[PDB]
Each structure stands twice: as C-alpha cells, then as structure tokens.
Amino acid sequence: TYRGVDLDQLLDMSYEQLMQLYSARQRRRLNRGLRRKQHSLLKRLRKAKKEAPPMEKPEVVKTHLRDMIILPEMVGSMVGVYNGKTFNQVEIKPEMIGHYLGEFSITYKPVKHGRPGIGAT
Amino acid sequence: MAVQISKKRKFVADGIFKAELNEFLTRELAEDGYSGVEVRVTPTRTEIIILATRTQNVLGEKGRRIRELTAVVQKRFGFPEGSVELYAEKVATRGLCAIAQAESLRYKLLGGLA
Amino acid sequence: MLMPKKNRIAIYELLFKEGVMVAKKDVHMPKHPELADKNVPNLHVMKAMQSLKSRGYVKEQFAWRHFYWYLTNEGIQYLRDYLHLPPEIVPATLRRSR
Amino acid sequence: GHQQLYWSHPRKFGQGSRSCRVCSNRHGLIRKYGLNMCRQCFRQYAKDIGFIKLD
Amino acid sequence: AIHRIRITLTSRNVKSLEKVCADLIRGAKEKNLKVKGPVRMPTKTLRITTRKTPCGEGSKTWDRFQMRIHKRLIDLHSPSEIVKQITSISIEPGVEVEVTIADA
Amino acid sequence: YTTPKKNKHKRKKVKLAVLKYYKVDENGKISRLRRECPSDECGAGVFMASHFDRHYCGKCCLTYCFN
RNA sequence: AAGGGCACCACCAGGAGUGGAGCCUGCGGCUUAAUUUGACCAACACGGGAAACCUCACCCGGCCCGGACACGGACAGGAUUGACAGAUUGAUAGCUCUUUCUCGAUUCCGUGGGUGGUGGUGCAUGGCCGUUCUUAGUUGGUGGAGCGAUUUGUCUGGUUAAUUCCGAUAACGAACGAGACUCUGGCAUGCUAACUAGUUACGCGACCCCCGAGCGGUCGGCGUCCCCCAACUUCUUAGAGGGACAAGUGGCGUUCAGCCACCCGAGAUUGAGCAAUAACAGGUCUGUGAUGCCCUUAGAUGUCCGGGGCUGCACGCGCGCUACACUGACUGGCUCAGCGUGUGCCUACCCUACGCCGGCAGGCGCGGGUAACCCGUUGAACCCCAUUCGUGAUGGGGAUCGGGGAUUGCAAUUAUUCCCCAUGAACGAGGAAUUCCCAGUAAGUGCGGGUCAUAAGCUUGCGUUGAUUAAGUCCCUGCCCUUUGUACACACCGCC
Ligand SMILES: [Mg+2]
C-alpha cells in the first residue's frame, strides 16, 4: 500500500497519473524524459519476469545504473545493482516504490574502529 | 549592439589577441631575431608590425614567408580577407633589445659556445 | 588513419591551394571549420597533417592550442603528383599576379 | 568504441566543459570577462593583455 | 545633409585620448563645425586579484591587476553634412573609435 | 595486475575467397540469387544478406524480415 | 656578555577574541577495493581544492589507436572497415560468438622507430613563488694597512623610519637598496565640458491650505539638444592644472643636521605597489606543446565510457560560523551605501524591470540593458521608532530527525540548493594556553566578485555604525650596529 491504493492498481497505473502519487523528486524525474537505458532495463525485467517459472522467483539481472526509481511493475524482481565493485541482488518489496535502486546497494562496508596508530599524539 | 560585445570584453579580447600573436611570433620567429610585434587597428583593416633584426631572413623567397604568416594569421583569427597586413620593421640599436639579445645568447649557447 | 580518400584529397587540395593551413587542437571536434561541407572530423585532418610532417613535406608550429602547418618545397612536387597537376599551378604564396 | 560511446558523455556545462585557453588545464581558470585562462597563464601574460599593477 | 552624429573615443591610457580629443576638435573648429563639449564617462576599472604563488604553498600573497578603461563622447553637429565633410581619422594604435548617428 | 579474465580475443574475419553468389546458365541468363537493396543509398548494384530469417543491406542497413 | 637603537607577525594598557557547546572545512589517525596526491613561523577555508558525471590523477569492468615514418610479408581472384538480427554484455560497446551483407588500398602483421602520460624524480632542473627580510643593509674601482685570509672606505659623536643627513675622517670617487617613484584619499563655488549626470529658473499640471495668503507647500509628475526650443556646473563625471615645503612663529639643538609646541591651513605621518647583495637542497615535474633522466606504451600508467570514491568515523588538531540572551528575541512602521557585475570563437550558460498565477520556495507572458541610457535613484543590513515577551535552557539556540513542495541537470541517493510544517540538543560567557590591533582602526553590520548548469559558513574587495586603551619599553619574543669571547663553521637544533 503506497498511497492507499493496492499493488494491482499500481500495476496498471500509468506514468502521468502516477506522478501525482510520487513525491516531488520522483515526479520531477518522471516529468523529465526517460532515456533509453531505463527503457532497456524495463524491457529486460519484463522479459525475465515473463520467462520466470511459476511460483518461482526470476533469474537475476545486473546493472550499473542505480538512479533508476522503483516502479510497482518491478515488484518481486531480481536486479543486480553495482556497488562500485560487485552487483548486489536485491528484492523489490511492495513498499520500495519511492526509492532509488542505489539506496539498497551500500557503497561501503561499515566501519569497525581498530586501535588508532601514530596519529593524534 | 547585440552582435558586438561590451567595451570590457572587447579590451579583454584585444589583449588576448595581442598576447597570442606575440607568443606565436616568438615561437615561430625565434631564430630570425624577433624583437616585438606592434598592431595598428582600424575598423577598415588592421596593420601588424613585426620588429626583428633579420628582416631579410623573415621575408622568404620573394616574400614567400611573410605571405605564409599573413595567411596563417588570416585563417587563424578569421579576419576578412585582405584586412590585415604584415610589415617587418628592422630594429634600431639591436644591442638595446632585451628579447633580441636573449635570443642571440640562447642561439649561442645552443650552438655550444662557452 | 582509416580516413577515406574523399577527405584526404580534399585536405590535400586545400593545403595546396594556399601554402599553409590552420588547425585547432581538439580531437573531439566533429568538424574542422573551413571546408565545412566536406564533413571532415578534426582528428582526421590532424593525423593527415602529422603524417605529412613525418614524411617531411610540411613543418608544424605549435602555439597555445593551434597548429600552423607550413608546406615545404618537398611538399610541392608531392602535392603535384598526388593531385595529378602539372608544374604550372602553384599554391597562392608561390606566385601572385606574375 | 564507435561514435555512440566515444564522446557520448555530456559536457555541455561544468568544469569538464572548460579548459585553459593557453595550457589546456582545467584548474584555476578565470571566467571573469570571458578570459577562459588558467591562473598561472594569467600571471604569465597579464602584462601582454595589459592588466598591470597599481596597488 | 542635416546630420547629427555621435563619436566615442576610448582606450586604456589618458594621454592618447586627450591628444585625440584635442586634435579632432581643433580640426573641427578650423573646419567650422560647432562641437558638443567633450564628455568623459566614468572610468572603467577592471580589478582582478590573484594569488602570487603558482603553487599555493607560501604566505598567501594575492596580486591584484587593474585595467583602467577611459572613454570620451564628443558629438559633431553641423547645419551642413558631416561625413562627406570630415573623413580623416588621425588614429594611433591602441585607441578605439566608433562613429554613430542620432538615429542610432 | 593479474587480470581475472583471460586476454580478450579480437574478432578474426572469415577470410572469404571469391564471392560467386550469382549464377547464369544455358549460354548465360542472369539470376540474382541475392535480394537487392531497394534504397538509392544502397543502389541497384549491391546485393542484400541472405540470413536464415532476415535480409541485410550492407549500406542501407535495411532488414527485410520474413516469418 | 656589555653598550646603543627598534617592532602590537613583541610587550606594556586595553579591546575584540580562539581554546569551553553545536555545526562547516582541511589535516592526522581508523576503516575501505578506492578513501588519489603535495604541503607538517614560512603546512592544516592552502594547492585559488565550495568532487553527483567531467573534474580525477584512486577502485571496480568494458571500448578504440588517436602506435607517425621506414622496410619486409599480405594482397582488388581482395590489405582490410563498418553493420541488421539472436545470444553475450550494465550498455542498441559488430566488444565476442552463429549468421551473412557491405568499404576498398585509406587499412593488417612483424621488425626498428614513434608518441602520449595529473607516471617517478622540486634532492637533476627553468620559470614563478615564499622565507631569511621589509629590517637597512650591500658592493665595485683607485688609494692606505696586512705575507695573507681580510680590512679602510662601509665611522667617535649627534640626527633620522632609514650607513637618512650633519660632521669628523687613509681615504677619494661612486652604485644599488632606502629615499625618490606611480596609484590611491583628502581642498579646490578656479578652467574645460557635459540629454548615457545633473543643478537652478520657468511653464504645464496633480493634491493640501484655500479663512486668504498663492513668489504658500510637495512631486523621483511632465517639457524647455525634440534643435532654436531657458541659463549654469554647486552637486555628479574626468582631464588639465593647483595645493604642503618643516613654509611661518616660539623653544631645544655644535645653533649644522634636525626635534617639540603653536598659528594659518583640507591636509603639518592617506594607504598600497615596486622594492638591494647573498642564499634556503623551503613549494610547485598535478599549469603548460617548460624540461633532463628513468618507467609504461596495446590486457596502456595514453585515452573513452558506466559505477563507486575523493564526504566514508572509537578520536586529536586549525582556520571559521552560529550562539549562550532584556544592550535581547519576535511583530509591524520609519529609514540611509559604495565597490563591482551582467548575454560568451570554441561555450549550450547573462543581469533583470513590469503583469498574472501560487502562501513560500517557483512558474507563466511582455519588455530593457553588450550598459553613467536597463536592472537601478542598486528603497542593504546594522541602526531608529512602537508591540509582545520577562530571567526560565524561555519567544534564546537551531544541531539531529520525519513528511511534503519547488529549481539545475542526463542523473539530486551517501540527502546539490531553496521552501512549509514538525524537534528544540549542547550551550548559563569557556582551564592550561594563545591570535590580532592605535582611527574611520578593532568590532557589529550587511553587499559585490572569484569558484557557479546548482550554489558560500571560504576568500578578494566594498560600504554602514563605530569605540576603549597608548604616544612608551626591552621585561617576554626577536630585529639592526659597535665592542667582546669561542674549542661553533652542516654554523648552539653546534661541539663535547
Ligand atoms: Mg519563539
């Protein structure tokens, strides 16, 4: 439930009437022109999802681009977001719509502070 | 007007043009005893005056080299054709020209003199 | 340079029409400005002139961001027998009104 | 690569859109009065352009 | 045309502008056109301040540069024609001249 | 260094001999066994490709697709 | 060690402060695949260094030669190049493969040889730059002394900011530095000029008084260079000029250099720039088609593209900003600037009036300005006048954090920035220590430019308000000269 509407209505919710439901930044993002990279990724997920086996999750697809906003039509996909080193698979939950792909592939590993060295004498 | 830039940018472009021309003539007329360049500008046409010790050397065969450099500056800054003239002026008292004496010394040292 | 003939001869005849030619150093320039309709990327003309310099027919002066190629006397006959043009047509700097 | 990726990356603005009009460097340029010159090159040529020191 | 023209003179220095503004108007008086008085616009002062070091290491010395641009406006107005009458420019290098008309 | 992948193999051309993909018989009767690219930029001179499911024009890059 | 002089990068007396809290930024360290790298008074809001791409030099993958030229193989019965589709790929990179079309001498391979490099070397270097050192010092010729290293000149004394000058004088004659110089600011009712600045006068007007003034008052309302159809430069502009010289007086002084007080004067010390010899293994090969040498050069340290990173955090440090409140905060009203910018060769990207929409952040049309014509008479802030508050972590404080809305772009997430509504955290004036500074100065206070497609807590300048303290010293840190002592000379961070 993204804005009170259910997921299935979000599947057939076209871009122009969905931009109202999106926040300001996403609405500006859809208002500006989608490029061929986004469309190619969408086609790849559509092909994989349709060729996905029943009751079974699809195969993984990788991508460098992480500025892709999540569409409800991608819920439940296997996408590989690059972290600068590797492509990290991530589930698309039905609550991740207003989120970037890169928000879930962390670019650094967390810091566990060891003993400081010669510095800060 | 809209096509012509303001006074400030005009003076800036003039200075840039002068500096680029001087630097190019330095890098090109190094051995010909280059001393300095003087540009006289009119809206009808501009005049470029080059100060050098060896005027007979900077002028090519029947003025070939001076024609060459005139065509170079013509095609470079995109003047209208025949709106720029290249005059070579033989300097007086070449011992006083710091640039010319510096170039003669550099030529001497590259020659291998003590 | 995989550059074709259609621009090789065009650049060569431009170089022979007048004793010099002016080129700015930008390999990503889509087009060298003069002969604008010939559709010649700047990289092709730069490397053609560089090859000619390597074979010594032209010498090169480098200012801030430009090339000022000066055709040589050894370039005269080479342009002549590459353009199939008799030794009576000269570049502009050679003869004038005589 | 081919024509579709060798120079496809946009540089219609920004620091990578500009270079020193003399030394082709991208640092310390002076875009005031459309100068488009590196700082060090401006020091080199300021006499030639005519910017002199008074104070 | 009956012509009323505007002439502006500008350069970097003051002496050359002064001698041009003097010799032109003297020639006009000798050539009996009444002359609008010489008008000096406020001086343009292009100020550019830059660190002296080309390295950034040191005591932070900033060098400042000035280009004083001076410009003068003198109008030639005569009952007779002007441009066919006065044609000579007498212009040294370094000073810019631009001649406009009243309609311009 | 020590790249994890092996050094990338550049494509090697098939090194074709004489083309000879058009035949005449009975003292000579022309038979274009290749599709002709219809465009002016391709011209009536060149032939098109004879791929198993489409036809490619070398210059016009038109693809005539048949099901 | 003595003698003498001198400096808010020293002090004295003061002021504002930092260090105490939060935040911004750069170092260090930690962590990482990468957190690129230089720099340790004279590094640490520095590299004009406010990184989404680029930048970028770092990490992770994928392209091409943009390897000239020579020779030899290869070849029009084809050197070789591109490309539809399918996989494959992040990629609609014909990058690779299946598949066949197409270019034709441009190109392929090998051997030499290029070339490129933000690759290494600032301890090979040039250039510039900082520092010694903005103190006053420094050198030649000839002559004197000395075997000579050197010395004299270049100094007893006085005086200066000043080896500045007077003087003595084995020195004489010079030279640079300083001074001088240029700009800057201060007075010029003196000159010149002014429709891209105006002033004054007049006439149109509008409104208040009209009891009655009426040559009453305001107008940033309109006209009088619209060409005969007012004058003038006080204001504004910027040129020529002038003006200050210790000039006069009194006093001190060898009565020389000169110093103090006083008159008249705008000013009786306006600030900057430039700036000597010799140097530092101080910095920059990441400015350069500045460069020696060395490294790499096709699986590229070249170069392109995609993504990440340069922000990453147990902590330390520096330059800053916000603040700790009533000398205040909020709400309203009144009211005054100057610097300087504004539409682009590449280069797309200007400053903006007015009108409408929306509450704000913005958007929608009409213009102006390539500029003393337009923004703009730059209606700035602080300040001033009234309101509420009332000594509380309170209406101070706005860090953290949520939701939403706008602009730039191809892309705003690890939030670009702006805006609305929420949160009011430390902080009650800051240890040991320490920065800066003598008049339009510190401080408050805003505003321009630089970086900018988006932009300033930075910086360069600008203006507004505007002080206390002091006219001295070597006590601390040092600087310069003479004498002195040395076992130092890489020079007391010495030597032993
Ligand atoms: Mg409150």
Side-chain angles (χ1 to χ4, degrees):
Chain A
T1 64
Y2 181 43
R3 293 285 192 260
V5 299
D6 59 355
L7 184 63
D8 306 345
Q9 172 74 341
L10 281 169
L11 270 295
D12 46 351
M13 199 74 195
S14 178
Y15 288 0
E16 271 82 3
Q17 64 277 41
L18 188 63
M19 294 187 288
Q20 285 71 61
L21 279 73
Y22 283 170
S23 302
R25 166 63 54 198
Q26 286 71 60
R27 168 172 41 255
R28 193 193 156 89
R29 175 64 172 285
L30 270 164
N31 192 0
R32 283 156 91 77
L34 284 181
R35 298 291 183 269
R36 181 205 201 77
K37 309 325 293 175
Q38 292 82 16
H39 284 326
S40 178
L41 184 73
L42 261 71
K43 185 184 287 185
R44 287 186 59 87
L45 277 72
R46 283 182 291 172
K47 185 181 289 292
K49 186 182 287 185
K50 270 72 175 176
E51 77 177 3
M55 60 80 70
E56 183 57 39
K57 328 192 84 182
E59 85 270 24
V60 62
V61 60
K62 315 197 269 153
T63 184
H64 291 110
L65 61 89
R66 44 192 287 151
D67 45 304
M68 190 79 232
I69 193 63
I70 279 166
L71 271 73
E73 59 96 13
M74 295 188 287
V75 175
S77 297
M78 295 298 106
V79 294
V81 177
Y82 205 56
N83 69 344
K85 182 174 72 175
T86 61
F87 292 93
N88 299 342
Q89 60 87 30
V90 63
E91 184 72 29
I92 296 93
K93 298 305 301 308
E95 295 84 4
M96 294 172 69
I97 294 93
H99 287 41
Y100 286 92
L101 281 182
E103 296 179 355
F104 311 97
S105 88
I106 191 167
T107 59
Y108 59 84
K109 64 178 70 65
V111 295
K112 299 289 94 175
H113 284 297
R115 182 64 60 85
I118 52 173
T121 303
Chain B
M1 62 183 179
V3 180
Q4 283 71 61
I5 60 173
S6 60
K7 294 294 143 79
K8 284 186 266 186
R9 288 173 94 89
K10 190 265 183 183
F11 276 74
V12 167
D14 292 332
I16 294 301
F17 163 61
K18 287 179 175 68
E20 154 74 30
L21 177 65
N22 191 84
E23 181 72 31
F24 161 69
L25 290 189
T26 295
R27 284 186 200 238
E28 169 66 31
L29 309 181
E31 71 274 11
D32 292 332
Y34 182 37
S35 314
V37 59
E38 195 281 318
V39 293
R40 188 174 189 269
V41 294
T42 61
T44 68
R45 64 176 175 85
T46 175
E47 185 85 8
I48 302 181
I49 290 159
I50 318 183
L51 275 298
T53 66
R54 299 206 79 78
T55 55
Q56 70 275 17
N57 196 26
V58 70
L59 259 56
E61 293 84 0
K62 312 287 293 179
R64 182 154 177 283
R65 187 175 180 179
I66 193 64
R67 262 189 303 279
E68 274 160 7
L69 273 71
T70 304
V72 169
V73 67
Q74 181 64 256
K75 298 193 154 49
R76 192 255 164 279
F77 306 96
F79 299 73
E81 293 309 295
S83 75
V84 54
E85 294 94 7
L86 268 69
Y87 285 6
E89 181 66 27
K90 198 169 84 193
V91 309
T93 74
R94 77 161 164 284
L96 298 196
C97 173
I99 297 283
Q101 291 320 320
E103 286 285 69
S104 66
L105 185 48
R106 176 184 68 103
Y107 180 76
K108 282 177 182 246
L109 290 190
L110 287 158
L113 278 81
Chain C
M1 208 67 253
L2 203 70
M3 60 171 271
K5 299 288 94 176
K6 67 180 291 294
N7 61 7
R8 180 96 55 171
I9 296 90
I11 296 168
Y12 279 23
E13 68 193 338
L14 178 69
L15 182 60
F16 184 77
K17 210 87 198 164
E18 68 276 12
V20 302
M21 64 86 69
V22 168
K24 183 177 184 293
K25 184 178 179 181
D26 189 330
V27 287
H28 298 91
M29 204 173 170
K31 174 64 180 174
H32 190 290
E34 66 269 17
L35 52 81
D37 45 357
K38 298 291 180 68
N39 291 319
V40 177
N42 201 66
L43 194 146
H44 281 183
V45 66
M46 286 173 68
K47 293 305 299 296
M49 298 305 293
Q50 191 273 331
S51 179
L52 283 183
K53 177 177 72 176
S54 189
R55 290 179 291 173
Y57 315 128
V58 66
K59 67 182 178 68
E60 178 286 316
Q61 186 67 224
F62 198 76
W64 295 353
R65 314 195 59 186
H66 271 72
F67 299 87
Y68 297 127
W69 277 292
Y70 293 98
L71 185 139
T72 78
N73 290 318
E74 279 197 8
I76 296 294
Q77 91 288 344
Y78 183 100
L79 266 297
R80 282 225 165 100
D81 64 358
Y82 193 87
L83 295 174
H84 322 111
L85 188 68
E88 194 274 331
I89 300 298
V90 299
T93 62
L94 272 296
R95 301 196 291 107
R96 55 96 174 174
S97 189
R98 267 77 173 172
Chain D
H2 42 59
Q3 301 87 11
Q4 285 70 241
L5 74 165
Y6 179 74
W7 204 235
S8 56
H9 167 224
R11 312 167 151 75
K12 271 75 72 175
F13 40 71
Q15 186 176 2
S17 71
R18 284 171 255 98
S19 67
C20 171
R21 90 162 63 208
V22 177
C23 66
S24 297
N25 194 18
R26 296 183 186 274
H27 300 274
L29 278 73
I30 310 180
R31 315 160 59 179
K32 195 176 186 183
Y33 314 113
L35 185 64
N36 285 89
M37 185 178 287
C38 190
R39 154 170 78 89
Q40 292 88 324
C41 296
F42 176 67
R43 290 204 73 241
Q44 181 163 309
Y45 290 97
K47 181 67 181 294
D48 300 353
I49 295 90
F51 283 99
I52 71 159
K53 291 169 68 175
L54 277 299
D55 58 342
Chain E
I2 307 296
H3 270 279
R4 306 294 181 186
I5 65 157
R6 177 172 292 171
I7 314 191
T8 184
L9 277 298
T10 184
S11 73
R12 307 215 313 278
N13 67 15
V14 176
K15 184 63 65 68
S16 75
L17 285 171
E18 277 317 306
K19 69 97 173 179
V20 173
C21 290
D23 69 1
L24 183 62
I25 66 170
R26 289 186 292 112
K29 311 295 208 323
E30 303 166 311
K31 195 171 182 178
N32 58 353
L33 283 73
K34 64 96 173 179
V35 176
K36 185 70 177 294
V39 177
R40 292 179 179 90
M41 308 291 286
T43 315
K44 296 290 181 68
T45 307
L46 281 73
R47 296 177 66 89
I48 289 187
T49 307
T50 302
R51 271 287 283 287
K52 282 184 181 288
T53 174
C55 179
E57 186 274 331
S59 185
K60 275 81 175 173
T61 46
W62 290 79
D63 190 356
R64 59 179 65 88
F65 298 92
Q66 296 180 359
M67 184 179 287
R68 308 267 190 83
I69 294 174
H70 317 258
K71 54 184 289 182
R72 282 86 169 93
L73 274 54
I74 307 145
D75 293 331
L76 275 298
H77 290 350
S78 67
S80 297
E81 214 278 339
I82 315 185
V83 189
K84 306 311 150 305
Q85 273 65 15
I86 186 66
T87 312
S88 57
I89 47 173
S90 68
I91 299 303
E92 73 276 14
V95 60
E96 191 274 332
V97 63
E98 182 66 26
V99 175
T100 80
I101 56 176
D103 302 349
Chain F
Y1 297 136
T2 308
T3 314
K5 196 188 77 63
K6 60 94 176 179
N7 200 358
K8 180 62 66 68
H9 163 263
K10 198 78 173 73
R11 173 190 162 186
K12 183 62 65 68
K13 291 181 174 66
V14 295
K15 185 70 175 178
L16 180 56
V18 56
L19 72 165
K20 291 298 182 199
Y21 43 81
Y22 52 93
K23 180 64 180 105
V24 301
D25 294 308
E26 49 259 14
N27 198 0
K29 270 93 177 175
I30 181 57
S31 75
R32 280 84 164 91
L33 60 88
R34 298 309 220 209
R35 185 63 171 280
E36 274 270 351
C37 168
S39 79
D40 47 341
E41 78 260 12
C42 280
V46 295
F47 294 165
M48 290 181 71
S50 294
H51 290 301
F52 79 104
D53 57 355
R54 78 277 188 192
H55 293 271
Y56 172 75
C57 188
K59 281 180 178 288
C60 48
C61 72
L62 270 298
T63 295
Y64 279 151
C65 49
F66 51 96
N67 317 301

